[PDB]
Design a protein around this ligand. Structure first.
Ligand SMILES: O=C(O)CCC(=O)c1ccc(F)cc1
Lengths: 237, 300
């Protein structure tokens, strides 16, 4: 069944689970043709598959060649996502396989269920959480690896850096979701907040700056203010 | 013409015979139904006046033996029985016929309704769905479950319809997941027609039998099976052309015969809107689309 706010702690228990977001799989630029029509051009995409307890991000890069000569790409994209998640679960050993896979959009349910018929014991579930994983591409290192890809590729990251050394998964997920919501609401302002100060740098293998605990409190407050500020700009509040 | 005599009618009961029905009062001098057209299966069915719980009945073919109905006061229902003494049996019916204690099967000569509802239905196939080998006729009621319903509970009392499940390994070839899920032609033509049913006549027979069990007994799993068998055809891009033409005729007579007041429960909105307006075969069911639009435009 669906995942929501009453069973939110379940994300951080010891049952292996994976969030799957397909919103950046099929990406296009829409432009005018010489004859005055409109045409799309695909650009590279990615599947965002995240284990929320560990921070493990299985970023499958979707190269534009996979759309060549294909029709109904928005529909194909869901099935290609499901094919790739299924291939990922098959690639992992039985003790690292998820018990549950939570899709961020209900349209992924039937594709993933059909691709996972061989895995009757893995639950495929929607969620009532509005998760801002579409903003993955606002993270500079992730955007860079996707746009540089010349072929299909699976790139691996910890989306929590080493935060799990100092905080719980629950807290790390809360931080990630606030950061991604802010990047989704006002990307330029969010990056400004994150990189305003040059003496706080991003370690060579990490995605986010090396903020101390107190500096993370400050950053989180600035992110909240940004969301509240945009919410007021939006609704004239 | 053949005859289903009744020993008696000790309890008030609405009796169905195929698409006809009539009421018998408690201990009225009724001894059965005569002039039953040879060449078709039939169904005799019952709904007790004092307890409309359990519609129930019997599928039979007069060519396969001499059958009569006798009330059992212990089990509380009209039971079908076979009489093996043929001369005994004829002797009994003739006396009942001479005393005019039997209703006549009221078939108009213009009327092909029953043929059109049972064209592909055979007794031998019924006896494989309804398993009770000691009898030549088959008992069905309102509450009997189907094998598929019992997988999601006394197997001896179940309807062994062919299981159809669109999200099953049987329906979906490894490596053809999107293809087979969006276009069920593989599942229809290779798994079901070539593999299980052997031909479209057996497929249509089970479909027609499922519809009749839904309509005459309110059997819920029968209704599920009828819709699943329609949806599997309609959801297939590749269906032999004669199959589509015959399906349209089969469905048209089913929709025509359905009691208007039972439509809210016997017709699945999602399946029908999908089959008529969105499916691969949305343009291939002209007669069924026309009667559904003119008779049940609310469902759509
Ligand atoms: O847990 C850690 O901090 C190190 C491992 C790690 O971060 C990881 C991330 C993605 C992956 F596929 C496999 C390991």
């Amino acid at each position: 069944g669906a995942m929501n706010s009453s069973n939110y702690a379940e994300l951080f228990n010891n049952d292996i689970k994976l969030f799957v977001d397909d919103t950046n799989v099929y990406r296009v630029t829409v432009h005018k043709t010489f004859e005055g029509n409109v045409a799309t051009k695909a650009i590279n995409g990615c599947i965002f598959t995240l284990n929320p307890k560990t921070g493990h991000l299985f970023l499958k890069i979707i190269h534009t060649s996979v759309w060549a000569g294909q029709k109904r790409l928005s529909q194909l994209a869901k099935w290609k996502t499901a094919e790739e998640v299924s291939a990922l679960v098959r690639s992992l050993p039985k003790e690292e396989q998820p018990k549950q896979i939570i899709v961020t959009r209900k349209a992924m349910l039937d594709p993933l269920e059909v691709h996972m018929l061989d895995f009757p014991n893995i639950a495929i579930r929607p969620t009532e959480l509005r998760l801002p994983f579409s903003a993955a591409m606002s993270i500079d290192k992730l955007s860079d690896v996707v746009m540089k890809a010349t072929e299909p590729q699976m790139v691996l990251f910890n989306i929590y850096d080493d935060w799990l050394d100092r905080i719980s998964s629950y807290t790390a997920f809360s931080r990630l979701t606030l950061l991604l919501r802010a990047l989704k609401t006002n990307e330029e302002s969010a990056k400004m907040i994150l990189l305003s100060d040059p003496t706080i740098t991003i370690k060579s293998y990490h995605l986010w700056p090396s903020f101390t605990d107190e500096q993370w409190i400050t950053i989180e407050s600035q992110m909240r203010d940004l969301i509240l500020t945009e919410y007021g700009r939006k609704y004239n509040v | 013409m053949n005859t289903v005599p009744f020993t008696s009618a000790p309890i008030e009961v609405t009796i169905g015979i195929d698409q006809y029905s009539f009421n018998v009062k408690e201990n009225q001098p009724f001894h059965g139904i005569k002039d039953i057209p040879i060449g078709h299966v039939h169904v005799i069915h019952f709904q007790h006046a004092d307890n409309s719980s359990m519609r129930y009945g019997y599928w039979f073919d007069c060519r396969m033996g001499n059958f009569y109905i006798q009330y059992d006061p212990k089990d509380g229902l009209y039971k079908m029985m076979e009489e093996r003494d043929g001369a005994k049996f004829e002797n009994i019916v003739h006396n009942f016929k001479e005393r005019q204690m039997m209703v006549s099967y009221p078939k108009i000569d213009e009327d092909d309704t029953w043929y059109n509802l049972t064209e592909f239905v055979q007794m031998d196939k019924i006896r494989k769905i309804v398993r009770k080998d000691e009898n030549q006729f088959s008992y069905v009621d309102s509450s009997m479950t189907t094998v598929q319903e019992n997988e999601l509970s006394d197997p001896a009392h179940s309807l062994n319809y062919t299981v159809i499940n669109f999200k099953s390994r049987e329906a979906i070839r490894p490596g053809h997941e999107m293809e087979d899920f969006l276009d069920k032609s593989y599942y229809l033509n290779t798994v079901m027609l070539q593999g299980i049913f052997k031909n479209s006549s057996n497929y249509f027979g089970e479909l027609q039998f499922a519809f009749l069990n839904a309509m005459f007994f309110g059997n819920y799993g029968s209704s599920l099976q009828w819709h699943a068998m329609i949806e599997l055809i309609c959801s297939s891009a590749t269906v032999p052309k004669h199959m589509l033409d015959k399906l349209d005729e089969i469905l048209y007579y089913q929709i025509k015969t359905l009691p208007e007041q039972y439509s809210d429960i016997l017709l699945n909105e999602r399946v029908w809107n999908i089959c008529l307006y969105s499916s691969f075969q949305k343009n291939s069911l002209h007669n069924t689309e026309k009667i559904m639009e003119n008779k049940y435009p609310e469902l759509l």
